[PDB]
Design a protein around this ligand. Structure first.
Ligand SMILES: NC(=O)N1CCC(C(=O)O)CC1
Length: 165
């Protein structure tokens, strides 16, 4: 199972790790993707997860969008995890750089509660423009299931751990 995580709360764990390498090692039941409403996995965690699937994630996602239309900001869908996990839970956090409402971050994290255990990134962090310290706060105050957070950036990981509470 998961190793090298620092326990933040009873159910939230954190590690300085590349979520792709973590997914390949662990092969969790659920890996969370930091998705957009169109499931266009271009950059950040989405681009990296998609590239690890040899673009199979993007092919599957385009078929999902063709059938269902875009997701809502704050929403999610369960698709295949491909070579990385049993499932990928594509979660759309608000993109602050697109003027999206940061209050939707709690709605985005609520999707994690439908899964007993997940490997995940901080939502709305990185290219989504939100404050990662605030994202971690929303995560611990919203998610009740077991969430293993992979934080790629060491400097951000240290800042998150040292400022937690
Ligand atoms: N979603 C996304 O691309 N990112 C958010 C999480 C960041 C991290 O873990 O240091 C990397 C960038």
């Amino acid at each position: 199972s998961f190793s090298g995580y620092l326990k933040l709360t009873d159910n939230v764990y954190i590690k300085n790790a590349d979520i792709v390498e973590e997914a390949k090692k662990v092969k969790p039941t659920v890996v969370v993707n930091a998705a957009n409403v169109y499931l266009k996995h271009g950059g950040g965690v989405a681009g990296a997860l998609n590239k690890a699937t040899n673009n199979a994630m993007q092919v599957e996602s385009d078929d999902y969008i063709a059938t269902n239309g875009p997701l809502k900001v704050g929403g999610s869908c369960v698709l295949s995890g491909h070579n990385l996990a049993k499932h990928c839970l594509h979660v759309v956090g608000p993109n602050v750089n697109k003027g999206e409402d940061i209050q939707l971050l709690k709605s985005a994290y609520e999707n994690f509660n439908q899964h007993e255990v997940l490997l995940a990134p901080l939502l709305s962090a990185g290219i989504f423009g939100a404050d990662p310290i605030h994202s971690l706060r929303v995560c611990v105050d919203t998610v009740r299931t077991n969430v293993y957070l992979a934080v790629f950036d060491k400097n951000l990981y240290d800042k998150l751990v040292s400022s937690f509470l």
